[PDB]
Design a protein around this ligand. Structure first.
Ligand SMILES: *[C@@H]1O[C@H](CO[C@@H]2O[C@@H](C)[C@@H](O)[C@@H](O)[C@@H]2O)[C@@H](O[C@@H]2O[C@H](CO)[C@@H](O[C@@H]3O[C@H](CO[C@H]4O[C@H](CO)[C@@H](O)[C@H](O)[C@@H]4O[C@@H]4O[C@H](CO)[C@@H](O)[C@H](O)[C@H]4NC(C)=O)[C@@H](O)[C@H](O[C@H]4O[C@H](CO)[C@@H](O)[C@H](O)[C@@H]4O[C@@H]4O[C@H](CO)[C@@H](O)[C@H](O)[C@H]4NC(C)=O)[C@@H]3O)[C@H](O)[C@H]2NC(C)=O)[C@H](O)[C@H]1NC(C)=O
Ligand SMILES: *[C@@H]1O[C@H](CO[C@@H]2O[C@@H](C)[C@@H](O)[C@@H](O)[C@@H]2O)[C@@H](O[C@@H]2O[C@H](CO)[C@@H](O[C@@H]3O[C@H](CO[C@H]4O[C@H](CO)[C@@H](O)[C@H](O)[C@@H]4O[C@@H]4O[C@H](CO)[C@@H](O)[C@H](O)[C@H]4NC(C)=O)[C@@H](O)[C@H](O[C@H]4O[C@H](CO)[C@@H](O)[C@H](O)[C@@H]4O[C@@H]4O[C@H](CO)[C@@H](O)[C@H](O)[C@H]4NC(C)=O)[C@@H]3O)[C@H](O)[C@H]2NC(C)=O)[C@H](O)[C@H]1NC(C)=O
Ligand SMILES: *[C@@H]1O[C@H](CO)[C@@H](O[C@@H]2O[C@H](CO)[C@@H](O[C@@H]3O[C@H](CO)[C@@H](O)[C@H](O[C@H]4O[C@H](CO)[C@@H](O)[C@H](O)[C@@H]4O)[C@@H]3O)[C@H](O)[C@H]2NC(C)=O)[C@H](O)[C@H]1NC(C)=O
Ligand SMILES: *[C@@H]1O[C@H](CO)[C@@H](O)[C@H](O)[C@H]1NC(C)=O
Ligand SMILES: *[C@@H]1O[C@H](CO)[C@@H](O)[C@H](O)[C@H]1NC(C)=O
Lengths: 209, 168, 212
């Protein structure tokens, strides 16, 4: 049969990595009726009901159905150590509470070495050149590849989704477009990645010519 | 002239499904001494003979316009019957609704199949969501309806929608 | 076991290597799943805008795991009928469905420009290792379904693993391929090639090989 449905989502990596953005794990109840609502979240963190569970209102959805979201503020360390977080919801529509649990990719890590390729000499024929940031064999999928210029960000880049290599490690190529005028003047462009297997969770190489 | 007979829809939905069952009734006379109803399909003659037409499996070659008339009761008036084929079907009593009355919408299934997570929409946006299958009684006409009203469900795992119907 | 609720149908296109290259048999496939204890039968009808069912030859029902006899049937295509842009429809019908469900796939539309193909060499700092990574950047094409392969003169190494196409900032796709070979072959002096196959490519082939 059917009823309300729960979706447990992990923190977005840039939050958990880099101590400056609190990391939250959002629990989303969906298809929650208007008659028969009142959803009760029973949060669990490695065996502790943890009553800092901050929930939210009843969201208004085209399909009349309601949608409730509750964010639990997490710790940067407790996520990475491997504590298992867990949502348990009940509603008079559910004849047995629906519980689902998550806890970060539990598997043996690896380091991402960050190599940085340059434009091909023919591309310098085009109107804008493409700078490549290679990120070889790492673990796990979560990662934060980003480009920067001189001082602050560059947002003219598109990054390949993580691929699975022959050994079981994840590589990914980011790429960023730039004015041939801007690349030939000699501005230095730095590629910064953030993974849970890099001391201080932050390596960053640089490219020029 | 004499009293008109009337055709009664059992159930009251003039929209059926290629496996749903309809039964038609006729009151007008009750043929005092001896009963007989004479039935008319698309302007013709069926040999039903009883006071009730029995349509177990509805299947296109069963739609059209219907009429009846017992041992008196003149001749019945024209009642229409549609037979769509699909999964969902937004059944209704009638569709002409002005001023202010009360509507009883139904999101029919198919081969009495269950329908999880049912929704009714107002020419796009929904208005009333249900977890299990039930009708959508709306009382006291909204004064702003009159847009395509359809429904969507879940016949097991299949994401099924309904063919639109315009009300006013 | 089962639980039932009304069968389903999935239609997949032909593999690019079979479309961009001749004397390859490219195909359209109708995968129908979730038939059950009712023993719902075959009935397959393929169309191009109404058509004949000669390229058909349905297979046998196979259940494997979950007791729902998978059924599949595959339709052969001419490399030229694709690409220009036909349609291809299924209309499969089961004695446990209201009305026969049908799907069509066709080709992707849209203006196809030719894929550029740049070739990138091992990173400066990547030479401090027994294994380097040759990189091939295929940027600027449209119809995603592209083919990328590597080779050394006349041998096909499966060393490489390639990124799936990723939408760029102008509707064109770009991808990356990585080939990890022992440095020796690199510095030693070999020539490695990145062949690219795209309907927007001369003879549907271009390789921008590289060496030190
Ligand atoms: C009424 O309407 C509401 C909402 O309206 C509509 O909402 C969306 C869908 C749009 O269409 C809007 O235009 C519109 O307003 C409906 O609510 C939706 O319900 C569906 C399911 O019924 C949900 O789908 C699920 O989505 C999750 C992921 O959802 C993220 O990404 C969505 C698209 O990118 C996005 O819309 C969501 O909001 C959410 O976005 C993320 O949010 C977090 C939290 O803030 C944020 O940090 C993220 O950054 C953000 N994402 C991004 C990219 O930024 C999806 O994962 C689910 O898939 C699981 O389940 C599937 C079903 O089996 C399965 O196929 C998948 O593989 C996956 O399965 C699980 O995966 C893992 C790995 O194995 C594991 O846990 C399980 O083993 C596995 N299997 C199962 C069974 O769990 C799923 O598809 C929508 O999210 C939800 N919309 C919401 C919540 O906003 C509602 O259904 C409507 N009802 C009716 C009756 O009409
Ligand atoms: C009972 O029996 C089997 C059990 O097999 C199971 O297989 C997996 C799933 C595991 O769970 C195993 O443990 C288990 O044994 C089930 O049969 C399968 O059922 C699933 C879902 O019901 C189907 O999944 C669909 O798969 C397509 C893609 O399918 C290709 O790739 C799969 C891997 O990605 C591969 O498994 C398939 O075999 C198939 O591979 C292709 O094979 C052909 C020939 O065999 C070959 O020529 C191709 O080259 C090859 N392709 C590749 C890449 O290798 C996937 O696209 C589907 O997604 C649709 O549905 C989603 C949710 O509805 C939706 O989000 C998607 O967008 C998509 O929906 C469509 O989207 C587009 C637009 O967005 C559009 O077409 C439509 O609008 C929309 N809807 C539809 C209907 O098309 C989907 O995930 C399997 O194909 C199927 N058969 C298999 C695996 O052989 C069965 O489900 C079991 N019962 C239950 C209840 O689970
Ligand atoms: C009383 O009148 C009603 C109508 O007022 C009439 O219902 C009609 O019956 C016919 C009989 O099939 C239906 O015709 C179908 O029309 C659809 C369009 O929706 C077509 O797609 C169909 O074509 C198929 O049929 C042929 C035979 O299977 C195939 O050879 C052909 O290739 C197609 O596959 C089909 O012709 C019609 O939809 C209904 N409804 C109407 C017209 O509103 C009813 O039959 C009359 N009473 C009696 C006893 O017949
Ligand atoms: C029943 O349907 C078929 C479909 O065309 C038709 O040949 C036949 O005449 C129909 N029967 C009647 C009574 O109309
Ligand atoms: C499936 O049904 C949902 C309603 O639950 C609807 O929002 C969605 O549009 C349907 N599928 C697709 C592919 O749109």
């Amino acid at each position: 049969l059917g009823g309300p449905s729960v979706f447990l989502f992990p923190p977005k990596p840039k939050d958990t990595l880099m101590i400056s953005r609190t990391p939250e794990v959002t629990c989303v109840v969906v298809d929650v009726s208007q008659e028969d609502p009142d959803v009760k979240f029973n949060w669990y963190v490695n065996g502790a009901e943890v009553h800092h569970a901050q929930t939210k209102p009843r969201e208004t959805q085209y399909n009349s159905t309601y949608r409730v979201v509750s964010v639990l503020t997490v710790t940067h360390q407790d996520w990475l150590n491997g504590k298992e977080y867990t949502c348990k919801v009940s509603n008079k529509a559910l004849p047995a509470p629906i519980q689902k649990t998550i806890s970060k990719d539990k598997g043996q890590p690896r380091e991402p070495q960050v190599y940085t390729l340059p434009p091909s000499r023919e591309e310098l024929t085009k109107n804008q050149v493409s700078l490549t940031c290679l990120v070889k064999g790492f673990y796990p999928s979560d990662i934060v590849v980003e480009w920067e210029s001189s001082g602050q960000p560059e947002n003219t880049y598109k990054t390949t989704p993580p691929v699975l290599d022959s050994d079981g490690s994840y590589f990914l190529y980011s790429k960023l477009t730039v004015d041939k005028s801007r690349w030939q003047q000699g501005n230095v462009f730095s590629c910064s990645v953030m993974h849970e297997a890099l001391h201080n969770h932050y390596t960053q190489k640089s490219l020029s010519v | 002239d004499l009293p008109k007979a009337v055709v009664f829809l059992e159930p009251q939905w003039y929209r059926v499904l290629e496996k749903d069952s309809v039964t038609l009734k006729c009151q007008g006379a009750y043929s005092p001494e001896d009963q007989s109803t004479r039935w008319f399909h698309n302007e013709s003659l069926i040999s039903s003979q009883t006071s009730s037409y029995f349509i177990a499996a509805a299947r296109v070659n069963n739609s059209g316009e219907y009429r009846c008339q017992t041992s008196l009761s003149t001749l019945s008036d024209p009642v229409q019957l549609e037979v769509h084929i699909g999964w969902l079907l937004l059944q209704a009593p009638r569709w002409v609704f002005k001023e202010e009355e009360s509507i009883h919408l139904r999101c029919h299934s198919w081969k009495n199949t269950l329908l999880h997570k049912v929704t009714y929409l107002q020419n796009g946006k929904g208005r009333k969501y249900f977890h299990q299958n039930s009708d959508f009684y709306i009382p006291k006409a909204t004064l702003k309806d009159s847009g395509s009203y359809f429904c969507r469900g879940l016949v097991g795992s299949k994401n099924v929608s309904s063919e639109t119907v315009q009300i006013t």
